Amino acid sequence: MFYHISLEHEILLHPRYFGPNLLNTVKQKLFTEVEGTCTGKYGFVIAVTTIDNIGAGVIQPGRGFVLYPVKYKAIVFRPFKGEVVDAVVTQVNKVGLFTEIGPMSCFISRHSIPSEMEFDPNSNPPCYKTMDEDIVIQQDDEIRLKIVGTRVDKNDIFAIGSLMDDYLGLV
Amino acid sequence: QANQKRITTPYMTKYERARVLGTRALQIAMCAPVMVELEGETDPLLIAMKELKARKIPIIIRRYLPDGSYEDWGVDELIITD
Amino acid sequence: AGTGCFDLLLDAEKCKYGMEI
Amino acid sequence: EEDASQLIFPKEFETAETLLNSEVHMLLEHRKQQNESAEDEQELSEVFMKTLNYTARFSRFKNRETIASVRSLLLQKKLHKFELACLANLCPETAEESKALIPSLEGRFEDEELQQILDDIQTKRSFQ
Numbered sequence: 001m002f003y004h005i006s007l008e009h010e011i012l013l014h015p016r017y018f019g020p021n022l023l024n025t026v027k028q029k030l031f032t033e034v035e036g037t038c039t040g041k042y043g044f045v046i047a048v049t050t051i052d053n054i055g056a057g058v059i060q061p062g063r064g065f066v067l068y069p070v071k072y073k074a075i076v077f078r079p080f081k082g083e084v085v086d087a088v089v090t091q092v093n094k095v096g097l098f099t100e101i102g103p104m105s106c107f108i109s110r111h112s113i114p115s116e117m118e119f120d121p122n123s124n125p126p127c128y129k130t131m132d133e134d135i136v137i138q139q140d141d142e143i144r145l146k147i148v149g150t151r152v153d154k155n156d157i158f159a160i161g162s163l164m165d166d167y168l169g170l171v
Numbered sequence: 172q173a174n175q176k177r178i179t180t181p182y183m184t185k186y187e188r189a190r191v192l193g194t195r196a197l198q199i200a201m202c203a204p205v206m207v208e209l210e211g212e213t214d215p216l217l218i219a220m221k222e223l224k225a226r227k228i229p230i231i232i233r234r235y236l237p238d239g240s241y242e243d244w245g246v247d248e249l250i251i252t253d
Numbered sequence: 254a255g256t257g258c259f260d261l262l263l264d265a266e267k268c269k270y271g272m273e274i
Numbered sequence: 275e276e277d278a279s280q281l282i283f284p285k286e287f288e289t290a291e292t293l294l295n296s297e298v299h300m301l302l303e304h305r306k307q308q309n310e311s312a313e314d315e316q317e318l319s320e321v322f323m324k325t326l327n328y329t330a331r332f333s334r335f336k337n338r339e340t341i342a343s344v345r346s347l348l349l350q351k352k353l354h355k356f357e358l359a360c361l362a363n364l365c366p367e368t369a370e371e372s373k374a375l376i377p378s379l380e381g382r383f384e385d386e387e388l389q390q391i392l393d394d395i396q397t398k399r400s401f402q
Contacts, residue, residue, distance in 0.1 A: 002292075002293070002298060002325075002329075003287065003290055003292060004290055004291060004292065004293060005286075005287055005290045014201060014202070015197075015198040015199075015201040015202060015203035016201065016202040016203065016274075018198065018203045018204055018229070018263065018268045018271060018274075019203075019204040019268050019269070019271030019272075019274035020268070020269050020271060020274060021274075022263075022265050022268045022269070023265050032316070035318070035319055035321075035322065036319035036320075036321045036322070044321065046298075046321070046322065046325050047302070047305065047318075047322055047325075049301065056231075056233075056243075056262050057262060057263040057265065058260060058261070058262060059194055059230065059260075059261040059262060059263055061190075061194075061257075061261075062197075064194065064197040064198050064200075064201050066263045075298060075301075077325065080276055080277070080278075081276070081277060082277045082278065082279070083278060083360075084364070084375055086332060086363075086364070088328070088331075100324075100328075101328075102324065102325045102328040102329065103321045103324055103325050103328075142331075142332075166374070167371065167374060167375060184255075185255075186255035186256040186258070186259075187256075187259060189255075189256055190256040190259070190261065191261065194261055203271070204268075204271025204272050204273050204274045205271070205272050205273065206267075206270050206271055206272070208272070227267075227270070228267075229263060229264045229267035229268045229270075229271075230261050230262065230263065230264065230267075231261070231262035231263070231264045232259055232260075232261060232262075233259060233260040233261070233262055234259050235258070235259065235260065241260075243262065245264055245267065247267070
């Protein structure tokens with residue numbers, strides 16, 4: 001679930017970057033560092049829309065690095081518990097359902113999956129199908145799911161979905 | 172505080188001079204661009220000294236008043252004793 | 254104390270006059 | 275500790291203005307126009323590409339003026355910003371679906387009012 005908020009970040013600049021394009025170097029460092037990272041509080045950082053303010057660069061005593069606090073507006077992807085966001089399943093296997101919500105990778109175990117869906121490897125793509133074959137989920141197919149929880153592992157977030165609720169799944 | 176109504180010594184203190192010189196020398200030793208034209212100067216301390224004499228060190232001295240306020244003085248805005 | 258009672262800031266405008274960058 | 279049912283969110287996100295997938299697609303198109311020119315810039319991360327294609331295939335509005343019109347008509351009605359964005363991107367066809375999938379809509383507008391609002395947004399929505 002994407003969001004647009006204001007974040008805070010601190011950049012340490014080497015003295016080699018002093019001179020012309022100093023503020024440009026600060027902006028480039030901010031883009032390189034902040035974009036692509038994910039934090040538990042704010043979720044994945046999609047991109048930065050605008051950089052609000054670069055604070056006064058405080059020269060740290062010793063080690064000569066200048067510290068520039070940066071205020072900026074960035075797009076942040078943040079799944080929440082119980083939220084239904086349309087997703088795309090990337091992989092399907094017996095262990096569970098592997099789905100993707102933009103930058104968010106979601107795993108859906110079969111325990112929460114309704115029993116109408118069964119695993120049939122005999123299909124050309126290894127996927128899940130029902131006996132009536134009305135409901136078929138394969139690669140890159142868009143399906144809806146609700147996030148039951150969120151967990152972060154090694155600065156990377158991983159969520160778990162579920163298909164318990166009605167009017168959810170294939171559209 | 173703003174540039175106007177600064178109530179502090181217009182003179183750079185010896186402590187400010189020492190710390191500015193050391194910081195600028197460290198910056199020069201870490202490949203910072205030199206604001207002044209150096210004539211065969213390889214010692215970062217001496218280059219920082221000649222920048223101080225040239226009013227070229229790109230450092231703002233933030234003077235904290237005991238009530239929590241501060242005044243930002245550029246090195247060029249201060250008059251050096253030497 | 255002295256050399257510790259104040260704080261140093263980098264002036265970005267004044268950096269826009271540097272040589273070997 | 276939060277859910278869209280009770281409309282409870284941490285106070286750190288109050289003035290945050292939510293958008294639609296079409297809106298973020300448009301802003302990323304602006305960013306693409308910015309970085310396509312002004313060369314000598316490193317390529318963006320794979321996370322950006324993943325988000326861009328995800329919001330491009332899920333885009334609900336392919337016309338900029340249609341995006342402006344849908345923003346205006348969604349703002350002219352009183353709804354929660356996150357709720358408004360979720361309803362717009364989910365784009366249900368009937369009021370019953372909107373109330374069932376989003377529990378925050380119980381009692382906001384009448385069933386006829388909700389149905390006609392959804393019909394208006396669908397008519398303004400560009401089908402493909």
